[PDB]
């Protein structure tokens, strides 16, 4: 299936020109932001979905992530498959590695408190991360075979929730500027 969901969340200030383009295409131009996550994907995430994308422009000026991004409820988990970033590579509590789609990724968990989520402004949730050990090349058609991450997460006691919220290929930014252009299918 092609994309049916548009993510466009900002907080904290600055500028985020998010453009919801044709098909699975979007762009972002941002400067001096607080936090933001923009992306296209699906209203209902699946553990079996293969996300295809092509980041034609990946041009963070500071801290941005090019990442699969999504939530489950039951319990509330935010997850990531970070394929690229800018000046800051995200980490947390090291759990292992997983190989998928031509890349080796480190696995991390982090627990968030008093934090915004799909449940509201002041919530607790766990984050699951797969973060590529080095930056993925962009401009080429890419696959994230998410099931590989789900299985590797489960092998380190990191179980997703059973009610799926959205699942998108995102540009995230924290206190940064930059540009992206990404197509998702
Ligand atoms: O859908 C929105 C979420 O994207 C948002 O979650 C925040 C996104 O930035 C991430 O870096 C943060 O960890 C997370 O708090 O919460 C609000 C919700 O509407």
Swiss-Prot record:
Record has Plastid as a keyword: no
EC number per UniProt: 3.2.1.8
The entry's keywords: Carbohydrate metabolism, Glycosidase, Hydrolase, Polysaccharide degradation, Signal, Xylan degradation
GO molecular function, one term: endo-1,4-beta-xylanase activity
InterPro entries referenced in this protein's UniProt entry, alphabetically: ConA-like_dom_sf, GH11/12, GH11_AS_1, GH11_AS_2, GH11_dom, Glyco_hydro_11
Residues at the active site: 78, 172
All copies of domain GH11, residue ranges: 1-185
Coiled coil: none
GO terms (BP aspect): xylan catabolic process
Result of changing residue 78 to S: Drastically reduced activity
Effect seen on changing residue 172 to S: Drastically reduced activity
The species this protein was found in: Bacillus subtilis (strain 168)
Pathway where it operates: Glycan degradation; xylan degradation
Family membership noted in the UniProt record: Belongs to the glycosyl hydrolase 11 (cellulase G) family.
Gene: xynA
Record keyword Signal present: yes
Record-given protein name: Endo-1,4-beta-xylanase A
Reactions performed catalytically: Endohydrolysis of (1->4)-beta-D-xylosidic linkages in xylans
């Amino acid at each position: 299936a092609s994309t049916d969901y548009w993510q466009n969340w900002t907080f904290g200030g600055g500028i985020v020109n998010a453009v919801n383009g044709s098909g699975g295409n979007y762009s972002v131009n941002w400067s001096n932001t607080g936090n933001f996550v923009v992306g296209k994907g699906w209203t209902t995430g699946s553990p079996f979905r293969t996300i295809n994308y092509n980041a034609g422009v990946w041009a963070p000026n500071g801290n941005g992530y090019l990442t699969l991004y999504g939530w489950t409820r039951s319990p509330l988990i935010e997850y990531y498959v970070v394929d690229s970033w800018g000046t800051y590579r995200p980490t947390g509590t090291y759990k292992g590695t997983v190989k998928s789609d031509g890349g080796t990724y480190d696995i991390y968990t982090t627990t968030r408190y008093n934090a915004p989520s799909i449940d509201g402004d002041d919530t607790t949730f766990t984050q699951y991360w797969s973060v590529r050990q080095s930056k993925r090349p962009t401009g080429s058609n890419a696959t994230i075979t998410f099931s590989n991450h789900v299985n590797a997460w489960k092998s380190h006691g990191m179980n997703l929730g059973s009610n799926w919220a959205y699942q998108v290929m995102a540009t995230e930014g924290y206190q940064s500027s930059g540009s992206s252009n990404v197509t998702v299918w």
